[PDB]
Amino acid sequence: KSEARRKELEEKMVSLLQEKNDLQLQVQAEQDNLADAEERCDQLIKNKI
Amino acid sequence: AAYLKLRNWQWWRLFTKVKPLLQSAEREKEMASMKEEFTRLKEALEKS
Question: What family does this belong to (chain B)?
Answer without folding.
Answer: Belongs to the TRAFAC class myosin-kinesin ATPase superfamily. Myosin family.
